[model samples]
Target: RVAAFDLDGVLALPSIAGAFRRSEEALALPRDFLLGAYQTEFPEGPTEQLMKGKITFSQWVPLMDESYRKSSKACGANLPENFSISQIFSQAMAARSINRPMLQAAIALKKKGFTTCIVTNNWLDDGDKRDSLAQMMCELSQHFDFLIESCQVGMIKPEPQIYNFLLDTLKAKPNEVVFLDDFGSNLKPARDMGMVTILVHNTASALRELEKVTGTQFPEAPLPVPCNPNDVSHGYVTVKPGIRLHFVEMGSGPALCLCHGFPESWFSWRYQIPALAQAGFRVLAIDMKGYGDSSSPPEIEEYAMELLCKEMVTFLDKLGIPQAVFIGHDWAGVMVWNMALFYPERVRAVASLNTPFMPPDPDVSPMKVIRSIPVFNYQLYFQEPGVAEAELEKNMSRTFKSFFRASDETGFIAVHKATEIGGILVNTPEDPNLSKITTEEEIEFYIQQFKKTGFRGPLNWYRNTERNWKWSCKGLGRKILVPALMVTAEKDIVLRPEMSKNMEKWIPFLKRGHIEDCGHWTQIEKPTEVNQILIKWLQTE
Candidate 1:
């Protein structure tokens, strides 16, 4: 099915004329009189011509000014005949901010498998500012399958031909289309053509009407539940005060707790769970708080390393296991380091994949150190509350696609390079940067889960950098007492292998290994090598 949305009144706030007048202190004409002037004088004749690209804004604005003066005189309000077109253009440009909800609604429709298009009646900006206008249009074009602009297409809306063009471009029958607009006149032709019409009176009502007609929910899709035999035994455990962690367990032997990292869940260890379980180990893979099915507290302090370490210890205690070998990847790798540091008695042996243990520096916070290096610029962005959450949640599907799929050449490397300068989150392109490391089905599973639980809870982990750093400072001069194994990815883009150079000094009993031809996602990228090495290491001690 095809779905189309109009700009201006439907997708943006306050009409152009209204905003223009509001910003203009010198213009004293009545709102209705000012609006009527443009409609009466230009009307369908020159306005259509201008929209059709037969005339430029420079040519059209002078005529609009003349019409405005004539209407003011007729309305018994004297106005300057020399009113400049430049003022009108400047005010209109300032009011062109996007309405995010409308944009999200359109994106939701596209994700629901509808052929979506933007049907906007907008004029070209002045010649000097055309590039700026083009950039904005290009950015909006990324969200839809097609865009039909009146100025570029030579057919203004409420005109049957423009609607016909939309249908033709979509390759959909009129009956299969759902057209939305704020103007009743614009909806009439589309409705007459046997297409469904939705009048956008307000965002809430318009979204409701669309949902009612299409039988689809905006910004939400059905989430996939874990069906794997290994994951079917999933359950929740209260690991800390007011904090519950979710876990999936299998097999029987020495208890081993598996921890996952940022933008991941217990599901991330799907390969290792059954593999390790069959290898004579009781595998307990957990969804870290603010991730998966775990109870995530709202505050950043709740996700601090001290709290996370307590969760790990209490999780083992709750399971009736005195101690367990802790294995972690990504942020969880960093997490296991803290676990071993804080509560060595509760940990048998700890293993970290892709992330090295950084000794605490009481003088500086982790975020400050990251900023100093400039390698981890995204960390600075993540440290700010609500910033990374908004960006990552903006498009969950895209978020998973970029995060889970990476190669040696593209993907994470490109992201790291792009953000190294400004620390902005980069959007994954149409083809994406890298070849897929995980299957599309797996990525879909992640997308489904993340759509239900936003990235905020997971991002809260980064927000506690100072808290974790300061808390770790209590044991500053000490070395890791527990036996540890640190695995580095040969092609990891984000975490420098060099970070592990001084591991022997901090972790006296550390065993370091490398996974060849792998990126930041060491375990998942090279599962067999990682598993064999991990299982062998576990067997040793």
Candidate 2:
């Protein structure tokens, strides 16, 4: 059996769609106005005519320019000098337009021993078109078994002959092929010819239909890693007054409670879930009380370290877990240390990643001390209620991409410097530094998670610092009586290795494991090393 994909809206979004969408945002003009210019006036407009290969790119450029002058000038100001249909068209062919998830699904289909081909209605090879268009197609063609373009054969989709040509070229019966196209017109002929057809809407829903046809998992939806899709369970438990913690659980044995810090969720612990589960422990990774689907209580005091630990105890109580080995990364690591101290009876053991247990100071609060550290100067910016939140939320993708980087001493210091000047991260340039810890899918997932519940809840964790520091001084000072492990990432600029230099002075029975050249997000940067360290410690304990 073979799978066929259309390029325009399936494998790669056509240039015009992106151009029009970008144009609509730039100008108040509607999307169709930019693309067709007069789809309403001339239903068979120059845009479709050009796409149909009746008009050349050179000819279409003048028509678009003339339309902008005549039509747009009447509604608003003249088109910006740089805003040309030609430039927009060329710009859309850049790296962003390639539907990566769709490409992944298609390539995965071919890998599963199914024949796959791109059956697109593109005119990229036209001599009048940009050479780069064809250049892009040449690279894409290498991935598929066949590249059937409308202009190459003088036959476009919705025309029976083009559909016939595909079947003839493959030498396969229609029933043996599954076709996907964005338009209903193109899909009908293939459907009538008895080929399984799926309409492309959005990637996720489209891939859901594709999965039904092929019985294979694709990369468009939720990643079913750490365990089978159905094996990992998700739910919510109210751990504090007006606070519900969302959690993902896998396996069933001694409880291994995983807690994540600011700007992260249970998803952060994805790599550790099944690894720890198979190592003979029930892994329950939670979206600790204020971020990502968990209830965000409006008060800043709700996020204080002592209260966070208290709520975590209630979380364990609700789960019928008397004592569990708690593992934490980023900010949750601090709360984990406090947990062993505040409720010693409920904590079997505790571990922290990248975040060390800071002994309380009699003279100064935790926040006050951290504020003095040059790397942690950002704490002051976050301490203000709405200052950093407004800035960080302005560009979620940019903010996440910048912060989630692997170690760069200058980059970390630059951001801290920016905090002292004004905004915590907005002043930080969109760093080109990509981390090995995350994927595009994971980044997109983080954006969506923060988008649902903005940075308000996440930032509130910083808001409670003074109160939390006071609680720390009043409660447990430095000593962690429970068995503990503190893992450090050697290259982490945020939490330097020396911070844990004598952390054993705090945790007497503590063991330390360090990953070479890893960044702040330890588990993700080197999950294998962290997991081994975890399993060994748990087994030994």
Candidate 3:
């Protein structure tokens, strides 16, 4: 969805984008004049100083526009022809109008299940014109799902709640939405709310702006080139035993295969990709058989533990990377941890994030043990046919964000399931301050992935612990010999770090560390540190 806003201070760099007229002097007028803020009558106040570059646009915009307008009298000063500030603002705004590329991108996003809104501070008449303009824009463009006018809501910028009003109106959480504004004061509030902020001074220029502000060079998006037909270096290739693999062979070094978790594709390693690539190592991240850009076979049994291990082995054979360090998180981690134990020679090293190899108790399986906790009950519900996929499609936005352990309306904190019992489970208690992770664009991406392949194929992994255990004990329930690392986030509700207490029992070569301020999606929440640790492990191996 598009976030439409006024030209001045929203998208048009007021000083450079020409939001206001370049005037000579100021005028002290009598009180009670409707001179309008953008342009009706020039006032001899801080506003004039702002035009001459005396005070910052931010310092003078609201005060001279609104505060002074309240106590001024209408008066006219000699002005140039066709010099209506409102018209200039409108003209400057055209760059980001719904008809523009930014809004076009947002509209294309809606098909993937996104919502949009706008937040701007403007004069009453300017607000009215913007509303009319938005209606007209929507009639022609069909972009924005909603338009938020500050005047209508009596909420304005720098207050922070102006964004809150939009979130409330749209029923969106801060992280579930993206906020774009040109003003630091405006964007700061949205940032405070946990919403991703894009200073839309120039959508094209944002990459540079972000780099300057954050002191980091954001990676340019991967080229829009089509899938390489003969791109043997990185394209999918069927490895041994019928499993396809995505291979990116670069420097001559030990191989590392990184696997992502639920509701995520290989793209989840955006942070780790370049880092590992530059470290003289050939890195491979794949859309685990049935998820994201990967091939999802029809039968659930195809996702069985043995089948997945065989697939991994075959995938490695196809790449000629006979043995490699295996990195996994969430579902991916669950598989790899067992892979290292079951086929020790196949994996040279291993790492798992926020998850430890949990063995099903011989007398009572771990699923039954976890089902005792109300938060774990969803595992049972997920075991039902069509239940999870249906719920996910219907509430894709909320459900996707809930992956980060975000809050829910029923005062429940959604936790990732690790076990199931009798297909009936309890729900998480409300977490008042749980923050959301995925945004609208991200949710739509997941929706597309799910639409291609249903959830049962992915959920089949849960149904296979018994099967995994049966094969995992090829001889004995012995520890893996490969060097390994386990990272746990202190705040992760789903897999408490303490759960890794006896990890050495399963992974004799395990080296562990706890990330102080992180949760489940540590790659995103703490990309730098996570990447560093992964890099260190890969290099040592």
Candidate 4:
């Protein structure tokens, strides 16, 4: 049983939202300098001490008081002589700390029999009492199994004793807990306590940490997915039972892990990864389960989104990175949403293409309906056992060609939408050619992988949406808190720009970019633009 999880910078994002408040209070002084202040304040403490270097909470409060008075006066208001200091700590600024989407997933883990507790420091001082924090705890209680507040407990951290209190309260030793915090100071104490300490730099990176603890990967230093330029070499990482997950790694420097959407494999990322690597990012593009080189697991249960999410975690574990910044595209789009919902600690920040998260309807089984354009009613067809295998294998070339067809004039989309008319499957006559959109080399790659693995595994992913939805809500209620970037291709077929509606409501630090003249396959269709977009975003983050 794990003893405790830190609240502020770990499970909850104190730094992300708080930084903006600090910056706003600082009058948004040059963006870079303000950001530097934001970074320095992340471990969290009183405002005054934060203005300089770190100071103990006691030494910091007096300065915080003066700064608060100063900022308040600038706004034509004055602090109440008897006000609660901690609650107003953020009043001078606009930053509000909330967990990233992955924090929602942490709740599910608790329901799955994990003992979790929140160990956090509230900025209460000589003027403020502990009971004032009750409202804050209510918001946090929706996810955490237990709550531990610093003022209430009479201790502040960077001191090993605070962690010890958590251990004693949970009746567990330090080794049983996995503690995480974005600031090294907080993490150092947890590490010394023998807790599995993970230093989460931001939300996207935190999701990676959750994946490692959940047994998704080996927990070893993950090898950077290869990114050699002019090298289209296909590399793979093996998981249990001789199953291989195909990966295309390119570029150099820090790792930027990319996951793609449905019906496509690592091939979908061909245009983007190399460009990212060239811009100084080591990129990892993976062919998720049942697609490309990865093997398909039988049963919709096996293809469950959480299970797939676990595989990505396992991938990270194999590489020994506790966390990585994650980006997702298309069907892989749900991953961006799901990973963050289930494991906030593993992600540093997030960049997603085309998909915005819409919490699923819990009462409905996601499989009851086939989503997306009528073209791929292939979803319902996939529900019938062996039908998909026979249909896909029988006319493998035509099937791939039809769906991969360049334009609607070719009638491939018509055939895909054919499920509406009848139950029977049909094989089209051998036409000279229709799918000119994908080069023969690309088509051959799909044919070879499909011939060996069939489409059963990939199709099953659709079958488990309801299960994933229900599981998502079991112990979940988190929001995205890291610096987030979203890039939408104007013409992406499966996802419309409208789908990103209300993203701002949930994502506190979101930055969105729109690209024109691109379709569902933005990266492949417009590589140069896609590369530039990602490069710019990584630099900003």
Candidate 5:
């Protein structure tokens, strides 16, 4: 009897995610870098061959450097003129972490007297990625009777040759072998070849099928949860009269609330909601007052920090959750941290993205400081009631396209040079597409909502900065005792990564994670990396 398994998505996750590491290395080039030119020149190029191990990684690097030249552009800035992209790509490869639960299940199957084999389609390694994968491959070999990788045999799966080769190596009948894979296309070939096939949706589901066929219980453990965004359920809650909040809920476990920042709604967490929900947490992504389907109060004082925090507690009371893990980004990013200070009894733990735990300074108003800085003058521009809103409302598409910028983007979008407050972000350049991180439909989502509700309520949050600052001062001298995690983005020009370093003094039970060369829109830009760090930290904490 034989059992065969897939590697990525089966035995391992895309990445296990990682810890706090500060690389003094300056900003990075675009992810594609010069490869864009290579692909442009050879539109029908040998990229397929590269994936099939016909070309080596060593050969690929030199090809990319042919068009490489450093310049003033943010895409090429800060890198040495002669720097090899291999170093950057190497760090990414080295960060891979295997799935522990599936590995445990595979080892258990091996111990059950079944001839366990790894049948995977993988590329040939060169340099550090080769070293990293080789180390994991070598470790995986000890648990299985055979290892058949696409690169090693020069034949990938879906090709009849590889499956035949796998059977020959194991010296087993096709009917006697049970093969499991994440993709249905990959499983179809094995099923047709007289091999018992199990389409792996997740670790637990696959293990149940394996137990049914082999007549032996392997092992029981918490495997990685698979994400299905379509499974989410949406609802609206009226926390109070005319103060309704909208949220999308998924999964059922300990409550984990995802709160978005300014000028954004629940949609901001599009990348995170499904993954966290799949990981056994009851995920709640909400649209606060002034955004999306949530109610918008006309008065500026209604958006005050204490009032906002009180609304959150009331939101929990409506959901019947006493305490929850509050994760927020941007303005709500600061708002959630204050949740720990204001209603520590209602919050189980807290995590912030890009935004940091700004120490309380009741004496000096943040408005004065934002008004002084030319770069942050937009906050001051927002202070004038209905001014920023009217401008942004007039050209909502132009407004959003200019706002959500990526690190690699060059040129100011007319709003960056706002020294004094007179509708600085009003006449933004005629831009067509949204930032690269977002899809065309996603940009439409933002525009459609703004058309319905306008930006007046969202901008009102900025109007209360002075009042929120004084209210936040009540949290002074009180250390955040809840377990907290801060994930900072290195290329975030607005909320620079350096701003987050001081948080350790106030949060005793804190963990730090950093995303390299990413902009203020951290989660969307580097979703997998952020999700990995999030799930890993949440599970451990």
Candidate 6:
């Protein structure tokens, strides 16, 4: 595949208007008039001659100044007879910055075996200014397989010759090329030439089209999709009355149930499901009630931990697995902990990610405990009816992007005071700094799932905080007779790793491990580390 990308307005961010505005102050020239004189060919102007190889850039400077000096009044510039083209060029180049996203995208395409070319209408001159620009262009070209400058080729864009020149240089058919430019005129020429054309609007939308046209990862690593039917298969099962749970299963050994946490589905265990299965276990990743394809009961009581645990038991019974090793993360961590607590006989062994087993405290409710600490006070917002649901459902992708982004150097803040006070949703930007650990496709998969299933069902889980506390006190308080594994993410922000400490007091046969350089989404973020630990623990049991 051959990919042709433009320069200015795409990979480069030089402001033409601002450049002219700066030069207009000293030269007494109108910004628009000077821009027009430099951009297009006026009968007297030398732009066409310079681009078409009729005159050198230095030689054309005097001609441009003479043309501007002669037509200053007519063009509304009112410039003096002696205007400096060098000053204008310097100002224009100073304001220019490389568009990192576009550069990154082009580099990504090059790395993916695409014959990438920079088809740009740029001028070359003889000086350090030109030399510095040449150096920068050289750096950019290092990632591309070819370079096609309009000035060098004597054919600028919106012209059939330039597009044909690129095709000839690449030795590819018109249909084999994919062209991207910020201008509609440039896109029209490429589209007319039978090449795939993408209009460079913003980074995200442009990359989306690039991915759609190329059928490959646009600017991020590609996500591995599960294909083997026995290794992974999506199916549904009726667990109880008016309740059916959706799951993705793999392997054919003693059952191992995988449960996801709040605002997540069976997809959360995507890495673990296959990993555990390959190591000799039947992995069943469920999209717990009110999530994924599972039936969501309208009443808040239906989401209680006791009821959710019961649903798991019923699901296992229907599958003819009297007992199975269970694994969970985040809010699922909360669920799997209770699963072992409420029905130890039904669970062989258990492992939890991020969230730890918190026994009910009679003196302090979970809500009170969280409210006292401001960092995780966002849970209070979720507990309220219609607050987080409306906010999260407003833009499902943006919500998940904000919610699941890993804690890293990007400075992504997942919680704030607005969430605790007015229950305002986490203020996610249009372009959130995505996690370095997960691929863009993985994030998109999560977004698509959330779009189909709004946040109402997930928020119901948080709504049962009080009910869970009251009901939890009725069981064994902070005591787990079953063997348990608690994996802690060292860099987790909301769920502090310290919360899992002193587990030996509660769980007598407890095994603990900490994954460094990982956030709350430990399983996905550090899949290799998590899988190794989980498989070892499960095998020993």
Q: Tens digit of lDDT per residue, candidate 6, span 289-327?
A: 888778876788888888888888988888788998888
Which candidate do you rate higher for TM-score, 1 or 3? Answer: 1
Candidate 4 structure, TM-score to reference: 0.53
Off by over 4 Å in 2: 1-231, 365-367, 408-413, 430-436, 476-478
> Please, what are the lDDT tens digits per residue for candidate 4 over residues 1-541?
5535566565655654465455445553333332332344243335424332345445555655555555454554444555333444443222334554445445445545677777765544333343323434544564566777665665556656667778778888777677766667667767666668666666635545565465333313321122222355566677667566778776555777888766667776776664566456777888888886777666678777777788877877777767777888866777767777676677766788877775655655555434544644766666677766676677666766656543232433333554665432354445427454566777777788677677778778767756777777653456777668888877555567887877777786789888886666666555667777877888888
Candidate 5 C-alpha RMSD relative to the actual structure: 21.0
Better of 1 and 2 by TM-score: 2
Stretches of candidate 6 exceeding 4 Å from the true structure: 1-231, 420-426
Q: Give each model a TM-score.
A: 0.56, 0.58, 0.53, 0.53, 0.60, 0.58
Colliding residue pairs in candidate 3: 26-44, 27-44, 30-73, 33-72, 33-74, 377-425, 377-426, 411-430
What TM-score number comes out for model 5? 0.60
Cα-lDDT of candidate 2: 0.73
Compose the digit string of candidate 1's lDDT tens values, residues 1-541: 8878886666665546555556344566565555542233234545566777778877777776666566556666767765665566645655465556666667677766788878977676675556545544644665678889888998777777888888889988998888777666778888899998888777545655565567476544322112243325887888656778888887677889899988897778777775687567988888888886888677777888887787777777787899899988888888898888888888899999988988767766567687777566677667777777887777666666677654454444234443544333464553454345666767767777776668788888878777777788887777898889988887777787888988888888789788878887765777767778888999887
Global CA lDDT of candidate 4, please?
Answer: 0.62
**Clashes found in each candidate (C-alpha, N, C closer than 3 A):** 0, 0, 8, 46, 0, 1
- Candidate 4: worst-modelled 10 consecutive residues by lDDT: 219-228
Q: List the residue pairs that clash in candidate 1.
A: none
RMSD of each: 22.6, 23.0, 17.5, 19.8, 21.0, 20.2
- TM-score ranking, best first: 5, 2, 6, 1, 4, 3
